[PDB]
């Protein structure tokens, strides 16, 4: 998928987790976010004029998705343990990772 | 100063900005945060076993303070224009930069 679709998948599923009632719903939404993050990691930020994969800022862009995936995996661990409220709180702590990349590259 | 003192300078002055009443108080607190950020940038995160300055994660650590300084400068621009509420809102958007580095390195 393109960057807009992957970002709206992250966006929508973050809200699904917030309103979820059980661990299966949380787990399903996190699993979809993980895939969207790894897909988005293959893209480049539009406003970044230098798109070189070896450039420090493209390293930083891809690295940000590795951090997000790691936090998604932390939340999935809690969901798989049945800890729904804890997993929802872990998903809330994703937001600063989203907002940080956005402020930096948009 | 050491890392703890610089971090508590960032912490305390973020609160000063929140409770400030005029542009001079906001400007003064942001100016002190800027200095603390550049000082902290010379340190290393304790839990990072590899302290090599050329290593990707030390590059990332120093880069995070460049981003924070840039956001501080954005807030200072607003404070210097007399835009107190706007500068306070810009300072609130620093928090995700703080929380992001913390989750990544602590
Ligand atoms: C964390 C869970 C999130 C969430 C919920 C979103 N993102 Fe991102 N994002 C990145 C870039 C470069 C853009 C700009 C895309 C463009 O200009 O075409 C975006 C954009 C968004 C949007 C806006 C979509 C729109 O309608 O314009 C939304 C809703 C969104 N994102 C959600 C880059 C990144 C990251 C790089 C490391 C990371 C991490 C995130 N975004 C994280 C998230
Ligand atoms: C943004 C404005 C902030 C604010 C308010 C704080 N930080 Fe940081 N911070 C970083 C590291 C590696 C540590 C660990 C230090 C250690 O283990 O000795 C910290 C710690 C803190 C604290 C806790 C102090 C304590 O009593 O233990 C506080 C209150 C704090 N910080 C405030 C690293 C970074 C960054 C690196 C790029 C950035 C940016 C920030 N911190 C940003 C902020
Ligand atoms: Zn959209
Ligand atoms: Zn960067
Ligand atoms: Zn980063
Ligand atoms: Zn302290
Ligand atoms: Zn890193």
Curated annotation (Swiss-Prot), chains A, B:
Transport recorded as keyword: yes
In this chain, composition skew of type Basic and acidic residues spans 47-60
Q: Does the keyword Signal apply?
A: yes
Cofactor names from the entry are: heme b
Name any Gene Ontology BP term.
electron transport chain
Q: Where does heme b bind?
A: 7, 102
Predominantly, its location class is periplasm
Cite the entry's keywords alphabetically: Electron transport, Heme, Iron, Metal-binding, Periplasm, Signal, Transport
What the record notes about the co-factor is: Binds 1 heme b (iron(II)-protoporphyrin IX) group per molecule.
Subcellular localization: Periplasm
Domain of life of the native organism:
Bacteria
From the UniProt entry, list the residue stretches annotated as the region Disordered: 38-60
**Gene Ontology molecular function:** electron transfer activity; heme binding; iron ion binding
A single Gene Ontology CC annotation of this entry is: periplasmic space
Question: Could you describe the subunit structure of this protein?
Answer: Monomer.
Similarity comment: family membership: Belongs to the cytochrome b562 family.
Function of the protein:
Electron-transport protein of unknown function.
What name does this protein carry?
A: Soluble cytochrome b562
Q: Which organism is it from?
A: Escherichia coli
Which residues of the intact protein are shown?
23 to 128 of 128
